[PDB]
Amino acid sequence: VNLSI
Amino acid sequence: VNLSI
Amino acid sequence: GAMGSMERASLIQKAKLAEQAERYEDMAAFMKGAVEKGEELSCEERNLLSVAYKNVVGGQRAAWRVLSSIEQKSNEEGSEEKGPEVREYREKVETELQGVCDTVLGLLDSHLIKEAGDAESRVFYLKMKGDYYRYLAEVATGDDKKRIIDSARSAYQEAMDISKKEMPPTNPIRLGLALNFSVFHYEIANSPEEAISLAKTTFDEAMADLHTLSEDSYKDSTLIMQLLRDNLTLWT
Amino acid sequence: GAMGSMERASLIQKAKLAEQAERYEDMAAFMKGAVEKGEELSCEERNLLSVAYKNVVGGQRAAWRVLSSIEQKSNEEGSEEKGPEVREYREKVETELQGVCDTVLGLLDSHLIKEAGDAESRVFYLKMKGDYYRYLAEVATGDDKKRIIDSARSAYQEAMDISKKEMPPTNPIRLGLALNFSVFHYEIANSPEEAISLAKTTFDEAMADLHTLSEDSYKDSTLIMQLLRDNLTLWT
Ligand SMILES: [Cl-]
Ligand SMILES: [Cl-]
Ligand SMILES: [Mg+2]
Ligand SMILES: [Mg+2]
Ligand SMILES: [Mg+2]
Ligand SMILES: [Mg+2]
């Protein structure tokens, strides 16, 4: 999955 | 911890 | 009830979806709705009911233990006063937990247990009754503590009596009932010797019956036998 | 509001307890109550707010994806008809998710953003506004889809403009904003080249500023730089 914060 | 089911 | 307008089959279908989505509060509400339709539950449906509430109450119990530990530390020697907040929030979680337990016990009493005549359903529901009184007992501190404990014991004992008469020693419901009743003895009733004796006798009698089983039944039974063994390793 | 009778400090104390207990819905409700007291939020308080709603909406998004995948399969060639239940329950989760997003966006608009004058608070809140419009965009399918996407873009862009003027390239808020805006480009705006360019330029400019930092700041910054790198490795 795309990494977000 | 005590194992339960 | 908010589920009163939904078909029984649709509630069961959505409970299975909620499980896949790890939405256990939804799963529990759907299965509560299914129970309240008033028909008896199939084996698969009973296990959906138990999976859902086990996950809900399991998270509440874990949160309660975190908060109770913080609370106990705050009451040690040399702990700075921090006000009523820790107690209040532990009480909030505790109250919600008790509410879930009361809801399950209410479903069992209205009217799942009285309609359950086969050993597999009756033992299953009486194990559940023992389990949820045990969860009440874990947080109990007042005048009713002893009666709560005895209600757990009484339900477990009725289930044990039926299971020993009506089920083989390897039956997974029988084995899980014995596992949890042994945890009751160790953790709630201050009876570790009873806990150890029950777990050992249950394990040994199952071991001696494994030869009667298919490969798939053998896997089901040995899985729970290993939990008995894990507890014995912790307790001895 | 149900938190209107509780002291601001008590709400913050209980938010921290809920976090320790992994009770993120409670944590979010406590922080919503704290915001509604009307005072600006400290750095630590802003991060409690974001942690709480990030966890709540994160679980809803994961559940929505599970259910949307089941729904898409049911609409394939050769899939047996199963009735409206999958769509209904996906819609239920979707509606609750949108409600959480609307609640956060409401707090930002009433009145967190308009009172935020320092770069660290203003960029933080505008990143949040971009993030929660992005979550709305992930589930959007109707006439408002393009406007939802543009609302996300506009908030991210205002935050980027301020962060580039007012913050060093290693600032963790700046870095996380850039990370999420690059995800917006890749996942929402159908702009993978923009996503890749942003992540690379952000990473390279941070790398060149690391020499100015203490050991602890270096650890904070490199942690988020590694997330930029992980995305670039996935996308290229
Ligand atoms: Cl509380
Ligand atoms: Cl639904
Ligand atoms: Mg009907
Ligand atoms: Mg019957
Ligand atoms: Mg006050
Ligand atoms: Mg201000």
Structure description:
The complex is a heterotetramer, with two copies of chain A (about 5 residues) and two copies of chain C (about 240 residues). Helix content of chain A is about 0%, strand content about 0%. Chain A is low in regular secondary structure and about 5 residues long. The radius of gyration of chain A is 5 Å and the shape is rod-shaped. The termini of chain A are far apart. Chain C has one domain (about 10-235): Delta-Endotoxin, domain 1, CATH 1.20.190. One chloride ion binds near residues 88, 89 and 92 of chain D. The PDB classes it as signaling protein.
Question: Characteristics of this structure?
Answer:
heterotetramer, A: 5 residues, little secondary structure, rod-shaped, C: 236 residues, mainly alpha, Delta-Endotoxin, domain 1, 79% helix, binds chloride ion, binds magnesium ion
What's the SSE blueprint?
The complex is a heterotetramer, with two copies of chain A (5 residues) and two copies of chain C (236 residues).
Chain A: no helix or strand
Chain C: H1 8-20, H2 24-36, H3 43-74, H4 85-115, H5 119-139, H6 145-166, H7 172-188, H8 192-207, H9 215-235
The complex binds chloride ion (2 copies) and magnesium ion (4 copies).
The site of one magnesium ion has 2 residues of chain C, from loops.
GO cellular component, one term (chains C, D): nucleus
Main location (chains C, D): cytoplasm
Pfam family, one (chains C, D): 14-3-3
Structural class of chain C: mainly alpha
Biggest sheet of chain A, open or closed, and with what strands and sense?
none
Distance between the termini of chain A: 12 Å
CATH third-level topology of chain C: Delta-Endotoxin, domain 1
Output the CATH class name of chain C. Answer: Mainly Alpha
CATH architecture of chain C: Up-down Bundle
Q: State the assembly state of the protein chains.
A: heterotetramer
User: How many strand elements of chain C?
Assistant: 0
Backbone CA Rg of chain C: 19 Å
> Which percent bin holds the helix content of chain C?
over 70%
Helix and strand run of chain C: HHHHHHHHH
Pfam family, one (chains C, D): 14-3-3
Subcellular location (chains C, D): Cytoplasm; Nucleus; Secreted
GO biological process, one term (chains C, D): keratinocyte development
GO molecular function (chains C, D): cadherin binding; identical protein binding; phosphoserine residue binding; protein kinase binding; protein kinase C inhibitor activity; protein sequestering activity
